[PDB]
């Protein structure tokens, strides 16, 4: 025989089915999930052309076996069941039975022999870091991935190890984001480009309350990357077949003036002033002096706006600009807002050169997160 039968905590299964359905999203009715009951666990397997997600959860395994059902149908049903635990039973011609105290659902099954097993990985480099560290690195870099699909090598995060630093960098031609953590063990240099969708899904997995305070193992090879998050969840991802640019050449080697400013005050003021702008001209102007900053904007046939920030040594309203010269320089407000929201920091530093040269953005208490943003003509 060997027919699946198990009892599972409902909330845990809901959590798993959430990850199973979001991973196989692509520009949903066709996706199947493999359920495998064995050795005190349920393994849920989801996959497409680009990623394979395997999740193991502890269950009461009553009878070992496997089956596959529609991911969406199983997700929708389990989310509406009120019992704290559910019974799942493959009933053959009757389908997969999902049973609570008062209700039974029967799902059509598909033959398990038609469901691919996970590929393996021959890692050139492997290491473990905390989930909090991995989350920070992706959180600081996902937002500046290119969405221009004709630039294949920029549609992901460049995950790489350089001299015991594990780093994510991303760029879209207009901004660059770099975030890293130092590793404990000697490890070979290596780099791969993780596609955006893979980055978004593993970030969501690492942020689960059951995982965020633990560790994730990461294994890199030339043709795939594998994550094992907190032992029980593994994700194998294809890589983007391309070459990430030497991004170090984007980082200003020197600057002529420096702004230190309260981050929330800065971010809130940029956002507020940006409202008046129009799609054709997404720009705010920073008019910087030692005594004041005015953030201004114009929107054709809409209006104009200006905010004044005065110099202050108070932390809540901090503003310091170390130059006798004035500087008027424009930026896309979205690109500044994205950096300012990526790091929870009291103040932020901006290092300027020429009006046409990129700004370097650093957070003084967060020294392993660095950002570069091109200006726009204003």
């Amino acid at each position: 025989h060997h027919m699946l039968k198990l009892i599972v905590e409902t909330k845990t299964l809901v959590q798993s089915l959430g990850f199973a359905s979001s991973v196989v999203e692509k520009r949903p009715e066709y996706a199947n999930i493999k359920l495998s009951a064995k050795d005190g666990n349920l393994e849920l397997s989801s996959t497409n052309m680009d990623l394979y997600l395997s999740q193991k959860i502890a269950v009461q395994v009553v009878s070992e076996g496997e089956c596959t059902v529609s991911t969406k149908t199983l997700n929708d049903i389990v989310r509406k069941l009120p019992d704290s635990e559910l019974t799942l039973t493959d009933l053959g011609t009757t389908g997969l039975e999902i049973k609570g105290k008062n209700c039974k659902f029967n799902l059509f099954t598909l033959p398990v022999s038609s469901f691919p097993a996970m590929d393996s990985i021959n890692p050139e480099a492997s290491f473990k870091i905390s989930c909090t560290d991995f989350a920070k690195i992706i959180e600081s870099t996902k937002f500046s991935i290119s969405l221009d699909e004709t630039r294949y090598n920029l549609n992901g995060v460049y995950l790489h190890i350089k001299d015991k630093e594990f780093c994510s960098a991303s760029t879209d031609g207009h901004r660059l984001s770099i975030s890293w953590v130092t590793l404990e063990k000697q490890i070979k240099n290596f780099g791969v480009i993780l596609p955006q969708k893979s980055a978004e899904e593993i970030l969501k997995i690492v942020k689960d309350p059951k995982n965020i305070n633990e560790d994730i193992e990461i294994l890199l090879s030339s043709n795939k990357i594998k994550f094992i998050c907190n032992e029980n969840t593994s994700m194998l991802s294809k890589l983007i077949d391309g070459t990430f640019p030497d991004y170090s050449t984007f980082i200003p080697e020197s600057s002529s003036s420096k702004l230190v400013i309260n981050r929330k005050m800065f971010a809130d003021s940029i956002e507020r002033i940006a409202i008046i702008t129009v799609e054709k001209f997404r720009a705010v102007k920073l008019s910087l002096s030692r005594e004041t900053l005015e953030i201004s904007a114009v929107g054709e046939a809409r209006g104009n706006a200006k905010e004044v920030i005065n110099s202050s040594q108070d932390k809540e309203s901090f503003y310091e600009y170390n130059s006798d010269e004035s500087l008027a320089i424009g930026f896309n407000p979205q690109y500044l807002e994205d950096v300012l929201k990526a790091v929870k920091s009291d103040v932020v530093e901006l290092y300027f050169s020429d009006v046409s040269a990129p700004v370097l953005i650093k957070f003084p208490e967060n020294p392993k997160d660095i950002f570069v943003v091109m200006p726009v003509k204003v």
Partner: peptide, 10 residues
Amino acid sequence: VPTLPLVPXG
């Protein structure tokens, strides 16, 4: 709207 010094691409 100038780009970072990507070579090529800008």
